[PDB]
Structures are given as C-alpha cells and as structure tokens.
Amino acid sequence: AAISFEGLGFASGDYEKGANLSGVETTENRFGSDVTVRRSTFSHGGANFDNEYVVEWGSWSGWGYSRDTDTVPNTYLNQMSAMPGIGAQGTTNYGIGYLSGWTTYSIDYASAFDFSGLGMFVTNTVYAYDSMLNGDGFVTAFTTGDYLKVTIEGFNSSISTGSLDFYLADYRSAIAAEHYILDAWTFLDLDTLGAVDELQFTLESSQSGVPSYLALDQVGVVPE
Numbered sequence: 001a002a003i004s005f006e007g008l009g010f011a012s013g014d015y016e017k018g019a020n021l022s023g024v025e026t027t028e029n030r031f032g033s034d035v036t037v038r039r040s041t042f043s044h045g046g047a048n049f050d051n052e053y054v055v056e057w058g059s060w061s062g063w064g065y066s067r068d069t070d071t072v073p074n075t076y077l078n079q080m081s082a083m084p085g086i087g088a089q090g091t092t093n094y095g096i097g098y099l100s101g102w103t104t105y106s107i108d109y110a111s112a113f114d115f116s117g118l119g120m121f122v123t124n125t126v127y128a129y130d131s132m133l134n135g136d137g138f139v140t141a142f143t144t145g146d147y148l149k150v151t152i153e154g155f156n157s158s159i160s161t162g163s164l165d166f167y168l169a170d171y172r173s174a175i176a177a178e179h180y181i182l183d184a185w186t187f188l189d190l191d192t193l194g195a196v197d198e199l200q201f202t203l204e205s206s207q208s209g210v211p212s213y214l215a216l217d218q219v220g221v222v223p224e
C-alpha cells in the first residue's frame with residue numbers, strides 16, 4: 001500500500017537520477033543552449049513520479065530514487081544519499097526529490113489514497129545537510145534566521161484537502177536550543193490530508209544557494 005520504493009531497479013550504480021529512465025526527448029533552449037530534455041515517469045504501485053533529465057548536461061530535476069549507503073560528502077557527486085545511508089524503517093530503497101527552483105512538484109495517484117491515520121518519512125540528503133551545516137561556495141553556514149522547510153499539500157480533483165509545513169532544518173529561533181538539522185528519518189503526520197489523488201511538495205529556504213533536495217520514504221504508513 002505504502003510507497004516504499006522497493007523493487008525499483010538500478011541499471012547503473014546505487015541510484016537513479018533519470019539517466020537510465022525511458023521517456024520522451026525534445027530539444028529546448030535553456031540558459032542560452034539547445035539541449036535534449038527527457039521527461040520520464042516512474043511508478044510505485046498507484047503513484048507516479050515525474051523526472052526531467054537534460055542529456056548534454058547530465059542534470060536532472062523532479063523525482064528519483066536510491067539505495068545509496070555512501071554518507072561521505074562530495075557535493076553533487078554524492079547527491080542521492082539520505083543522511084542515514086539507508087531507507088526508513090530499515091528498508092533498502094528510498095526517494096529523492098530535486099525540487100529545483102523552489103517551485104512545486106507532485107506525486108500523482110491513479111486512484112485516491114487515504115492518508116487518515118498515516119504519514120511518511122523525510123530527512124535531509126548528505127549533500128544538503130553538509131551544505132547547510134558547514135557552508136560552501138553558495139551557502140553561509142546556518143546561523144540564527146536560517147531554515148529549510150517543505151510544504152506538503154493534498155489535492156483531490158484539484159481541490160486542496162489541506163496544507164502542512166515541516167522544517168528539515170530550523171535555525172530561525174533567537175533561542176539556540178530550538179535550532180536543528182534533521183539527520184534521521186523523521187515521521188511526518190499526514191492524517192489531516194485525508195483522501196488525495198495528488199501530494200504537492202514545495203521547498204523553501206532562508207538561502208537560495210541551499211541544495212534544493214529532500215529525501216522521502218515509506219509514504220503512507222502508520223506511526224511507530
């Protein structure tokens with residue numbers, strides 16, 4: 001029932017960013033270059049995940065998946081690993097979103113899924129975590145005022161069933177003791193969304209240089 005990502009295959013290595021997904025390719029002009037854009041969708045049960053891969057750049061956006069256990073930071077060369085180096089609830093596979101440009105991306109259900117009594121797991125990627133914690137060429141190391149959050153909104157036939165915020169990293173508080181960055185799979189309660197045919201995800205950050213990723217897993221399970 002739950003989206004576990006299990007029994008999605010790995011054609012190459014320990015993750016899928018879209019380079020080996022089958023999809024539809026068109027030529028588009030982007031940042032001044034004509035490039036080949038592949039739009040693909042992978043499925044897990046009733047749920048559909050859109051992926052966009054630009055062939056010439058090797059860049060991607062939208063959704064991918066992983067079983068990666070490598071937790072050594074190596075900027076974008078290790079971008080598909082969740083901080084725990086394993087999926088949630090001891091499972092091998094998990095999802096990755098590169099929710100590029102701080103806009104909205106969706107999981108599309110063929111049939112309504114009821115989140116009553118249920119939730120999902122999220123955490124940070126190694127790349128994003130390390131960037132926020134320590135800083136890089138694009139990011140000032142997180143201090144008072146910094147944050148990374150995700151808004152999760154349910155829809156049913158394009159009508160909102162409710163909207164929830166959850167902080168992947170919260171340094172906003174004047175009280176330093178309130179500051180944290182998630183390094184573990186963390187349960188997010190989605191009960192109030194009820195029956196949805198679409199879940200929308202949007203990241204927001206104090207700093208636009210923060211790698212716009214989250215790790216997600218076990219979508220639609222009971223609290224443990």
Ligand code: CNC
Nearest residue numbers: 031057058059060076098131136138139208209210211212
């Ligand atoms: C344009 C752009 C941007 N990108 Co790229 C994205 N999406 N990117 C791209 C494209 C570059 C096109 C080109 N070279 O012609 C494009 C789509 C290929 C790309 C690719 C990537 N990008 C990536 C990321 C994560 C980032 N990108 C941003 C720089 C991110 C930007 C948003 C932002 N917040 O800054 C961004 C939208 C605007 C940059 C810009 O135009 N600056 C103005 C320009 C005049 O200045 P510049 O300093 O010369 O910009 C150069 C660099 O930004 C470089 N570059 C672009 N992305 C990266 C990523 C890294 C790690 C490095 C070292 C350099 C770059 O290319 C620019 C032109 O040469 C980023 C800050 C967005 C974000 N917040 O997530 C972030 C880096 C985060 C970090 N702290 O390390 C990818 C890993 C995304 C992916 N999932 O595939 C990937 C890495 C390279 C690869 N090919 O695999």
Ligand SMILES: [Ca+2]
Nearest residue numbers: 004087091093
């Ligand atoms: Ca899993």
